[PDB]
Amino acid sequence: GVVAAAEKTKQGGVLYVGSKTKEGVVHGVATVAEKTKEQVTNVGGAVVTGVTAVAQKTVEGAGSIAAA
Amino acid sequence: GVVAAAEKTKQGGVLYVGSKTKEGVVHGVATVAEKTKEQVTNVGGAVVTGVTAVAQKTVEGAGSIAAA
Amino acid sequence: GVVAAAEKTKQGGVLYVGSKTKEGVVHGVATVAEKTKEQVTNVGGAVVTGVTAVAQKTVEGAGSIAAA
Amino acid sequence: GVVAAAEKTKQGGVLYVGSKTKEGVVHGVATVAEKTKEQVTNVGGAVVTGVTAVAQKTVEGAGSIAAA
Amino acid sequence: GVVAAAEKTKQGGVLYVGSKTKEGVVHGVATVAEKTKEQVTNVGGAVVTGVTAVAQKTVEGAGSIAAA
Amino acid sequence: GVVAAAEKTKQGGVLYVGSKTKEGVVHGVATVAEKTKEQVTNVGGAVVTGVTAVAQKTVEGAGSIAAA
């Protein structure tokens, strides 16, 4: 077996982004493996997919992951 | 199998995003495996999929995953 | 056998997003595996799928997952 | 056998989104497997599908999943 | 045998979305498997399917159920 | 077996980005491995995918990861 965990606590801005380009297909995070036993896809913190996508002050939480 | 847990506690702005492009198909996070036995797809925190998608101040909880 | 759990506790805005593109089919998070014993699809935190979809201040709760 | 549980406790806004595209079929989270024994499809937290769908402040609850 | 349970306790807003596209069929979360013995579909937290359907402040409850 | 965890505590802006060039497909982070058994994909902190995508003051939380 395995264990993992996280928590957040607390005890105590402009940005200009315009998209312009003629094409984009986007894959955020991705993998392949043929003839494979233990294909495990894991994602944490913040990740987002968009042909434009923005991360102001984005992760104030916390986290961790494990596998196999 | 596997065991895990998480929590939040608490004890104590502009953004400009304009889409413009002629096409985009999008896949957020994805994987494939043929002739394959133990396919496990895991996602946590915040992840979102859109041709535009935005992550302002987004993850303020906490998290973890583990598998297989 | 298997166990998992989560909770939230507590003890103590602008964004401009305009979509514009001529096409997009979108699949949020997805997988395939032919000839497969243990196909397990798990999703937690926040995930949503839309040709535009947005994550303002989104995950203030908390969570975890495990499998197989 | 198998076990899972979750709870919430508590002890203590703008967004502009306009859809515009000429087409989109969308499938939110999906999987397929031919000749396959134990297909288990699980979804938690928040997930929704719509050609636009938005996740303002969305998950304040908590949750978890396991299978097999 | 098998176990799962949950409930909620407590002890202590704008969004603009207009749909516009010429077509989209949508199926929210779905899976298929031919020649399959233990075909199980499970859904928790918040889920709905609609050509637009929206997840403002959506899961204030908590949950799980778990399988096989 | 395996163990890992993280937390955050606390006890105590202009930028100009206009996208313009004629095309870009972008993949955030990705890998492939044929005939390979233990495919593990893990991501944390903040990373985001967009042909323009921006990281003002982005990770003030913390985390770490391990596998296999």
Curated annotation (Swiss-Prot), chains A, B, C, D, E, F:
Subcellular location: Cytoplasm; Membrane; Nucleus; Synapse
Sequence repeats mapped onto the chain: 19-33, 34-44
Modified residues (Phosphoserine): S64
Chain intervals for the UniProt region annotation (4 X 11 AA tandem repeats of [EGS]-K-T-K-[EQ]-[GQ]-V-X(4)): 7-44
Tissue spec: Highly expressed in presynaptic terminals in the central nervous system. Expressed principally in brain.
Subunit details: Soluble monomer. Homotetramer. A dynamic intracellular population of tetramers and monomers coexists normally and the tetramer plays an essential role in maintaining homeostasis. Interacts with UCHL1. Interacts with phospholipase D and histones. Interacts (via N-terminus) with synphilin-1/SNCAIP; this interaction promotes formation of SNCA inclusions in the cytoplasm. Interacts with CALM1. Interacts with STXBP1; this interaction controls SNCA self-replicating aggregation. Interacts with SNARE components VAMP2 and SNAP25; these interactions allows SNARE complex assembly and integrity.
Protein name stated in the entry: Alpha-synuclein
This protein's encoding gene: SNCA
Residues of the full protein shown: 14 to 91 of 140
